[PDB]
Amino acid sequence: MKVKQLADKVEELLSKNYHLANEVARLAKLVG
Amino acid sequence: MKVKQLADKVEELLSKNYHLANEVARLAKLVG
Amino acid sequence: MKVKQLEDAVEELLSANYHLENAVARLKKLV
Amino acid sequence: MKVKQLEDAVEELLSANYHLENAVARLKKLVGER
Numbered sequence: 001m002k003v004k005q006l007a008d009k010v011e012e013l014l015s016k017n018y019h020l021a022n023e024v025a026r027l028a029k030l031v032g
Numbered sequence: 033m034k035v036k037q038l039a040d041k042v043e044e045l046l047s048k049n050y051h052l053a054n055e056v057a058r059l060a061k062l063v064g
Numbered sequence: 065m066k067v068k069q070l071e072d073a074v075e076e077l078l079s080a081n082y083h084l085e086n087a088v089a090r091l092k093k094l095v
Numbered sequence: 096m097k098v099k100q101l102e103d104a105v106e107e108l109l110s111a112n113y114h115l116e117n118a119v120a121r122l123k124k125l126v127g128e129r
C-alpha cells in the first residue's frame with residue numbers, strides 16, 4: 001500500500017541520516 | 033580557539049540532529 | 065582554510081536541522 | 096491527508112540527507128580522507 005511504502009521510505013532515509021551524522025561526528029574528531 | 037569553537041558547534045548541532053531524527057521516527061510510526 | 069571549511073560544515077548542519085524540523089512539523093500535524 | 100503529509104516528510108528527509116552529505120564531503124576534504 002501507499003502509506004506503508006512511504007513509512008518504509010521514511011525509515012530508509014532515517015537509516016542513511018543516522019550514518020551520515022555518525023560520519024560527521026567521526027570526521028569532526030579528526031579536524032585537529 | 034576558533035577551530036575548537038567550531039568543532040564544539042558541529043557537536044552541538046549533531047546532538048540536535050539526532051533528536052530530530054528520533055522524533056521523525058517516533059512520529060512516522062504513529063502517522064503510518 | 066580550515067576555519068572556512070568548518071564554517072561551511074556548520075552551515076550544512078544548520079540546513080540539515082532545518083529540514084528535519086520541517087519533517088517533524090509535518091508529522092505532528094499528521095498524528 | 097496522511098499520504099500528502101508523509102510525501103512531504105520524505106521530501107524534507109531527502110533535503111536533510113543532502114545537507115549531511117555535504118557536511119561529510121567538506122570534513123573529508125578538510126582532514127584529507129578520500
Ligand code: NA
Nearest residue numbers: 079083110114
Ligand atoms: Na536546504
